[model samples]
Target: GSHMEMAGDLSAGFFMEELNTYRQKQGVVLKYQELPNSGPPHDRRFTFQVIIDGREFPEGEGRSKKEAKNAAAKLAVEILNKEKKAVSPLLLTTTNSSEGLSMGNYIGLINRIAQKKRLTVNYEQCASGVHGPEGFHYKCKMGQKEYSIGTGSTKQEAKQLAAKLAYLQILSEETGSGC
Candidate 1:
């Protein structure tokens, strides 16, 4: 016998706009916004792929997924530094299981991103029961559209690092937080 599972999806359009506004307030050039659509041609897929300067940042899947995403983010930053692209449009797709999200500890993670990173993040969920372990995942798009990162795990360590990365990106773009 085979087991089937359901999944969740979150819309991130308004959140992206908010993030752009924050960036603009800090002197960043806003480009575009990407949001999830519930209409036709829409299928439930949680994968977020970003490309910068022809280089495709690896997705958060497969073995060493976290490491792969970190490498991609680092590479994106290096390219942005060399090319001097301060800001660009970005999008993120995040999901959390009812079990993990209901714990309430994750709220800090959301608040930190909104306050520290000055990002407008929209969160959504697709309820499903087919996956192995229940947990949450977050996709991040920092400073240039090229600099992207993804993390998924129940471990608090992973969440902390992701938060730090997001915060750092905000820091890199401006000079007043005193962080």
Candidate 2:
């Protein structure tokens, strides 16, 4: 009966100090990189950019280092909140959406997220045998150094299983399970 998509903190503030807290909660190190003036030092431009957990955030530019850090931190934190919190609201409700969407078609399923979340995906067939207990040992190498593996008699099934696990890795990050 109600939908307020614009209510998200798309236009917001109050950053910097608490961003460290956010990083602490995620247990990921926080560091900011800055560039010197692009033009005359007397009337200069400072650009500050931040990277977190292999995810590169947008660059922040300002006239002063203070302003640059503030801008950069704010920009990065906004997205951190997005990938961690704002992103979850539109996902499954009731703590479950099983059968709500296609489950096995994880190729497209994981693609939907990888494209949107800016992650790199690489697949490999580590082990496959003609007979016996050994099957297709499929692996999906993920960004942030995460890895997911799947095993099935058919290569297709193994691929899907790997994608399914990759999907859950992102879900856990976005859902704030922190587990």
Candidate 3:
């Protein structure tokens, strides 16, 4: 099973959405606030705190307000579990949400849809331009058609983004099923 950490961050938007529904079922409303941030201007860090009615769940800090919100929900889930073991497994809830558009995450989704459409999912790394600190270029195609083109800070950076957007295309609708 994957583990959680202070450094581990995911999408706060996804977690917040889930938490809203979770809290709704319990006759309670969830809200969050921007806690004071720290760190240098060039690399400032942010913190966010969540509240359940009059109570504070747990605070999470991150490089972005977005991630802090995610971390907050993450910890709140921990508290919820302590309140009751039947609060639902995090992994179960996360997967059922179906926003798996991240790099390592969307490959499966791409394959699943491509199989039915019989379209080939091809992810390629474009020629590196000027071997400076500049990252890698990537392109994604399905059925010999360009779906997305972009670059990333890391090798997998662009790779992931391309597949995600390309998946968006194949996911929208397919071409002539056989032709």
If both were scored by lDDT, which would come out higher, candidate 1 or candidate 3? 3
Instruction: At residue 170, give the lDDT of candidate 3.
Output: 64
| Candidate 3 residue spans exceeding 4 A from truth | 1-104, 127-131, 143-146, 174-179
Candidate 3 C-alpha lDDT tens digits along 57-127? 56767645445766777677776678755667556634457666554577667777678756677677765
Model 1 / residue 112 / CA error / Å: 5.1
Clashes of 1: 6
Clashes of each: 6, 0, 0
Clashing pairs in 2: none
**Tens-digit lDDT string for candidate 1 (2-69):** 11122111453332344444445545443321222223555432233334423334332111222233
lDDT per model, in order?
0.41, 0.65, 0.66
For residue 112, what is the lDDT in candidate 1?
A: 63
